[PDB]
Design a protein around this motif. Structure first.
Motif, PDB file in Angstrom:
ATOM      1  N   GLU A   1       0.829  -1.210   0.000  1.00 30.38           N
ATOM      2  CA  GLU A   1       0.000   0.000   0.000  1.00 30.38           C
ATOM      3  C   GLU A   1       0.865   1.263   0.000  1.00 30.38           C
ATOM      4  O   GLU A   1       0.496   2.281  -0.593  1.00 30.38           O
ATOM      5  CB  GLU A   1      -0.928   0.006   1.223  1.00 30.38           C
ATOM      6  CG  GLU A   1      -1.755   1.283   1.401  1.00 30.38           C
ATOM      7  CD  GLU A   1      -3.032   1.309   0.560  1.00 30.38           C
ATOM      8  OE1 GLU A   1      -2.992   0.859  -0.616  1.00 30.38           O
ATOM      9  OE2 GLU A   1      -4.070   1.798   1.082  1.00 30.38           O
ATOM     10  N   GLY A   2       2.019   1.183   0.664  1.00 31.52           N
ATOM     11  CA  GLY A   2       2.925   2.314   0.727  1.00 31.52           C
ATOM     12  C   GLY A   2       3.468   2.726  -0.630  1.00 31.52           C
ATOM     13  O   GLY A   2       3.582   3.915  -0.912  1.00 31.52           O
ATOM     14  N   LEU A   3       3.809   1.756  -1.475  1.00 29.47           N
ATOM     15  CA  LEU A   3       4.342   2.064  -2.797  1.00 29.47           C
ATOM     16  C   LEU A   3       3.285   2.785  -3.622  1.00 29.47           C
ATOM     17  O   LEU A   3       3.600   3.702  -4.391  1.00 29.47           O
ATOM     18  CB  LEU A   3       4.783   0.780  -3.518  1.00 29.47           C
ATOM     19  CG  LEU A   3       5.293   0.914  -4.962  1.00 29.47           C
ATOM     20  CD1 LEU A   3       6.404   1.946  -5.034  1.00 29.47           C
ATOM     21  CD2 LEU A   3       5.786  -0.438  -5.461  1.00 29.47           C
ATOM     22  N   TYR A   4       2.032   2.365  -3.465  1.00 31.71           N
ATOM     23  CA  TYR A   4       0.919   2.983  -4.184  1.00 31.71           C
ATOM     24  C   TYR A   4       0.759   4.453  -3.782  1.00 31.71           C
ATOM     25  O   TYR A   4       0.710   5.330  -4.637  1.00 31.71           O
ATOM     26  CB  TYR A   4      -0.373   2.216  -3.891  1.00 31.71           C
ATOM     27  CG  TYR A   4      -1.639   2.940  -4.281  1.00 31.71           C
ATOM     28  CD1 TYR A   4      -2.095   2.947  -5.601  1.00 31.71           C
ATOM     29  CD2 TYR A   4      -2.393   3.613  -3.320  1.00 31.71           C
ATOM     30  CE1 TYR A   4      -3.284   3.607  -5.952  1.00 31.71           C
ATOM     31  CE2 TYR A   4      -3.574   4.274  -3.653  1.00 31.71           C
ATOM     32  CZ  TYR A   4      -4.018   4.267  -4.966  1.00 31.71           C
ATOM     33  OH  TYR A   4      -5.206   4.905  -5.262  1.00 31.71           O
ATOM     34  N   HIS A   5       0.666   4.725  -2.482  1.00 27.94           N
ATOM     35  CA  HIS A   5       0.528   6.103  -2.009  1.00 27.94           C
ATOM     36  C   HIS A   5       1.758   6.941  -2.359  1.00 27.94           C
ATOM     37  O   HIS A   5       1.655   8.151  -2.568  1.00 27.94           O
ATOM     38  CB  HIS A   5       0.323   6.143  -0.492  1.00 27.94           C
ATOM     39  CG  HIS A   5      -1.032   5.683  -0.054  1.00 27.94           C
ATOM     40  ND1 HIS A   5      -2.196   6.302  -0.459  1.00 27.94           N
ATOM     41  CD2 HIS A   5      -1.411   4.662   0.753  1.00 27.94           C
ATOM     42  CE1 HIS A   5      -3.232   5.681   0.076  1.00 27.94           C
ATOM     43  NE2 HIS A   5      -2.784   4.682   0.815  1.00 27.94           N
ATOM     44  N   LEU A   6       2.915   6.288  -2.419  1.00 25.36           N
ATOM     45  CA  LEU A   6       4.173   6.960  -2.727  1.00 25.36           C
ATOM     46  C   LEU A   6       4.193   7.422  -4.169  1.00 25.36           C
ATOM     47  O   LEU A   6       4.637   8.524  -4.479  1.00 25.36           O
ATOM     48  CB  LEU A   6       5.345   6.010  -2.486  1.00 25.36           C
ATOM     49  CG  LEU A   6       6.750   6.577  -2.252  1.00 25.36           C
ATOM     50  CD1 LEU A   6       7.732   5.794  -3.116  1.00 25.36           C
ATOM     51  CD2 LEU A   6       6.811   8.076  -2.569  1.00 25.36           C
ATOM     52  N   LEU A   7       3.708   6.567  -5.055  1.00 20.03           N
ATOM     53  CA  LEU A   7       3.669   6.886  -6.472  1.00 20.03           C
ATOM     54  C   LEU A   7       2.626   7.960  -6.771  1.00 20.03           C
ATOM     55  O   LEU A   7       2.823   8.797  -7.655  1.00 20.03           O
ATOM     56  CB  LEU A   7       3.373   5.623  -7.279  1.00 20.03           C
ATOM     57  CG  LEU A   7       4.466   4.551  -7.250  1.00 20.03           C
ATOM     58  CD1 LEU A   7       3.929   3.241  -7.814  1.00 20.03           C
ATOM     59  CD2 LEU A   7       5.668   5.042  -8.054  1.00 20.03           C
ATOM     60  N   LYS A   8       1.518   7.943  -6.037  1.00 22.38           N
ATOM     61  CA  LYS A   8       0.478   8.935  -6.255  1.00 22.38           C
ATOM     62  C   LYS A   8       0.910  10.306  -5.748  1.00 22.38           C
ATOM     63  O   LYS A   8       0.576  11.335  -6.344  1.00 22.38           O
ATOM     64  CB  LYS A   8      -0.812   8.509  -5.564  1.00 22.38           C
ATOM     65  CG  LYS A   8      -1.379   7.221  -6.109  1.00 22.38           C
ATOM     66  CD  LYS A   8      -2.877   7.322  -6.238  1.00 22.38           C
ATOM     67  CE  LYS A   8      -3.255   8.341  -7.285  1.00 22.38           C
ATOM     68  NZ  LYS A   8      -4.724   8.358  -7.443  1.00 22.38           N
ATOM     69  N   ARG A   9       1.655  10.324  -4.649  1.00 26.49           N
ATOM     70  CA  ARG A   9       2.132  11.581  -4.095  1.00 26.49           C
ATOM     71  C   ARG A   9       3.114  12.228  -5.060  1.00 26.49           C
ATOM     72  O   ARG A   9       2.945  13.380  -5.452  1.00 26.49           O
ATOM     73  CB  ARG A   9       2.813  11.344  -2.749  1.00 26.49           C
ATOM     74  CG  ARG A   9       3.484  12.571  -2.157  1.00 26.49           C
ATOM     75  CD  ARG A   9       3.981  12.270  -0.755  1.00 26.49           C
ATOM     76  NE  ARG A   9       4.737  13.380  -0.185  1.00 26.49           N
ATOM     77  CZ  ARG A   9       5.335  13.339   1.001  1.00 26.49           C
ATOM     78  NH1 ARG A   9       5.266  12.242   1.746  1.00 26.49           N
ATOM     79  NH2 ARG A   9       6.003  14.395   1.443  1.00 26.49           N
ATOM     80  N   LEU A  10       4.136  11.470  -5.444  1.00 21.69           N
ATOM     81  CA  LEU A  10       5.161  11.947  -6.361  1.00 21.69           C
ATOM     82  C   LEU A  10       4.610  12.322  -7.737  1.00 21.69           C
ATOM     83  O   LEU A  10       5.158  13.200  -8.402  1.00 21.69           O
ATOM     84  CB  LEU A  10       6.258  10.886  -6.509  1.00 21.69           C
ATOM     85  CG  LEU A  10       7.002  10.509  -5.222  1.00 21.69           C
ATOM     86  CD1 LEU A  10       7.965   9.387  -5.497  1.00 21.69           C
ATOM     87  CD2 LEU A  10       7.746  11.714  -4.678  1.00 21.69           C
ATOM     88  N   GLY A  11       3.532  11.665  -8.163  1.00 20.31           N
ATOM     89  CA  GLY A  11       2.935  11.959  -9.459  1.00 20.31           C
ATOM     90  C   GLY A  11       2.556  13.421  -9.663  1.00 20.31           C
ATOM     91  O   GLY A  11       2.647  13.937 -10.775  1.00 20.31           O
ATOM     92  N   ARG A  12       2.124  14.088  -8.596  1.00 14.24           N
ATOM     93  CA  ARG A  12       1.751  15.495  -8.681  1.00 14.24           C
ATOM     94  C   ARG A  12       2.919  16.413  -8.338  1.00 14.24           C
ATOM     95  O   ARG A  12       3.034  17.497  -8.907  1.00 14.24           O
ATOM     96  CB  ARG A  12       0.577  15.799  -7.748  1.00 14.24           C
ATOM     97  CG  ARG A  12      -0.661  14.970  -8.038  1.00 14.24           C
ATOM     98  CD  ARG A  12      -1.168  15.169  -9.465  1.00 14.24           C
ATOM     99  NE  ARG A  12      -2.044  14.066  -9.854  1.00 14.24           N
ATOM    100  CZ  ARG A  12      -3.209  13.786  -9.274  1.00 14.24           C
ATOM    101  NH1 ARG A  12      -3.657  14.537  -8.272  1.00 14.24           N
ATOM    102  NH2 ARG A  12      -3.912  12.731  -9.676  1.00 14.24           N
ATOM    103  N   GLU A  13       3.777  15.978  -7.410  1.00 13.51           N
ATOM    104  CA  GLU A  13       4.950  16.761  -6.992  1.00 13.51           C
ATOM    105  C   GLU A  13       6.060  16.774  -8.046  1.00 13.51           C
ATOM    106  O   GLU A  13       6.638  17.824  -8.333  1.00 13.51           O
ATOM    107  CB  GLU A  13       5.547  16.218  -5.681  1.00 13.51           C
ATOM    108  CG  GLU A  13       4.806  16.598  -4.416  1.00 13.51           C
ATOM    109  CD  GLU A  13       5.579  16.248  -3.147  1.00 13.51           C
ATOM    110  OE1 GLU A  13       6.655  16.847  -2.911  1.00 13.51           O
ATOM    111  OE2 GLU A  13       5.112  15.376  -2.381  1.00 13.51           O
TER     112      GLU A  13
END
Length: 426
Positions: A313-325
């Motif tokens: 789950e962490g990798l998923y939230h990590l990729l979504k966060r970085l996607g906008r940043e």
């Protein structure tokens, strides 16, 4: 973003061997591994995987794996024995040949310039505490770019500067092994300087795609303030300066040794073509004393042999966060898991737990992509078991089991799994 890239990754000192062959100079790790208490099993990077001699064999394993890209690093001390000045042609010859074999095999080269093996010669002059090392790094990057950029489309400057800085200069569990918060902060800055200086050298020598590889770790806790400190320390400390928004509020309660010039921050924030994302596990913290006002707590759920919380789950939230940043495409340049593998002659080493871990993180990674994150690649950490730094050979991450005494490579269930995953993902 054509054709998703499936690959495997390694690093020169962790697999090469031939530590003192063909003129290679000593690295800070060769020095560190001579100090008792540095490595768990008291081993070193010799003979490692002896990849220096068996590279063709290994390239053949990747061919039968179906992989489209192979992330590896170049041993700086193999190109410039003293980190600066004289060049050892055998060094460049080896990598030149390695690249030829990869293309001949249909595999794309993904070069990591600095994967922790700073020439000891440079350490003696201060290592990463001196900006002279930063200039040396840009000259090394240049020498390598002018020799391989014609066939290597992907170039990554640094790999996990967080580790090299704090792990190597503060906690001292990594090379060179200091334990001074000041040295660590100086090192983090001079590392970023090198990144910026190399990106320009690379650019100038025709590197088609230039980036950097950073590791991240979502932080959890009951006190949002302790958690935030942790977030800035593990995830934003290097990402921010690289995106051009300077340093985030320092996670430390200790002022840096010297001022950072405005000039620097703009030189450090050179435009990239991709961000390399490394993910293994999240972190759990609580408020604490010390320069970093936080203390790590034992993992909460299932763990690997490393004792690292396994949390796709962490990798998923990590990729979504970085996607906008992050304004550049992302490549998961490292994702793996260490489990106690047992081999007694079998043709296949059964990898149930490692298979479960990889499939889960792949599932989470693709979900995040389906939701709009520009993810263009996934690289399993290590093709084969290798020198796991401080842990020596007591922790295996490969898709291929390596019986070090005989150097024989044995496919694990995870290897058969990955080949099937790639084939169908196409």
């Amino acid at each position: 973003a054509e054709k998703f890239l499936w690959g495997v990754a390694t690093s020169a000192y962790q697999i090469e061997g031939a530590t003192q062959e063909d003129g290679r100079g000593p690295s800070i790790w060769d020095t560190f591994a001579r100090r008792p208490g540095a490595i768990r099993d008291g081993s070193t990077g010799e003979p490692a995987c002896d990849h220096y001699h068996r590279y063709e064999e290994d390239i053949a394993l990747m061919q039968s794996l179906g992989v489209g890209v192979y992330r590896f690093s170049v041993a700086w001390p193999r190109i410039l024995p003293e980190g600066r000045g004289r060049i050892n042609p055998k060094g460049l010859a080896f990598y030149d040949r390695l690249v030829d074999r990869l293309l001949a095999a249909g595999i794309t080269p993904f070069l990591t310039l600095y994967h922790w093996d700073l020439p000891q010669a440079l350490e003696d002059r201060g290592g990463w505490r001196s900006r002279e090392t930063a200039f040396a790094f840009a000259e090394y990057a240049e020498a390598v770019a002018r020799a391989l950029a014609d066939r290597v489309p992907f170039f990554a400057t640094l790999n996990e500067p967080w580790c090299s800085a704090f792990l190597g200069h503060w906690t001292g569990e990594h090379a060179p092994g200091l334990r001074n918060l000041e040295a660590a902060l100086r090192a983090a800055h001079h590392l970023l300087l090198g990144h910026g200086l190399a990106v320009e050298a690379l650019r100038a020598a025709g590197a088609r795609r230039v980036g950097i590889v950073l590791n991240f770790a979502p932080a959890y806790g009951e006190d949002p303030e302790a958690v935030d400190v942790a977030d800035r320390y593990h995830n934003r400390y290097f990402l921010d300066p690289i995106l051009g928004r300077g340093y985030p509020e320092s996670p430390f309660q200790d002022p840096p040794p010297a001022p950072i010039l405005s000039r620097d921050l703009e030189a450090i924030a050179r435009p990239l073509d991709f961000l390399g994302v490394n993910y293994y596990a999240p972190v759990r913290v609580a408020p604490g004393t010390g320069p970093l006002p936080v203390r790590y707590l034992p993992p909460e759920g299932p763990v690997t042999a490393m004792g690292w919380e396994v949390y796709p789950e962490g990798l998923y939230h990590l990729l979504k966060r970085l996607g906008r940043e992050v304004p550049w495409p992302l490549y998961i340049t490292e994702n793996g898991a260490a489990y106690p593998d047992l081999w007694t002659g079998e043709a296949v080493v059964e990898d149930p737990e490692r298979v479960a871990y990889l499939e889960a993180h792949v599932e989470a990674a693709l979900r995040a992509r389906e939701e709009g994150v520009d993810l263009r690649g996934y690289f399993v950490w290590s093709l084969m078991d290798n020198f796991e730094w401080a842990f020596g050979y007591t922790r295996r991450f490969g898709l291929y089991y390596v019986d070090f005494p005989s150097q024989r490579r044995i496919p694990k269930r995870s290897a058969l799994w990955y080949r099937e995953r790639i084939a169908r993902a196409q």
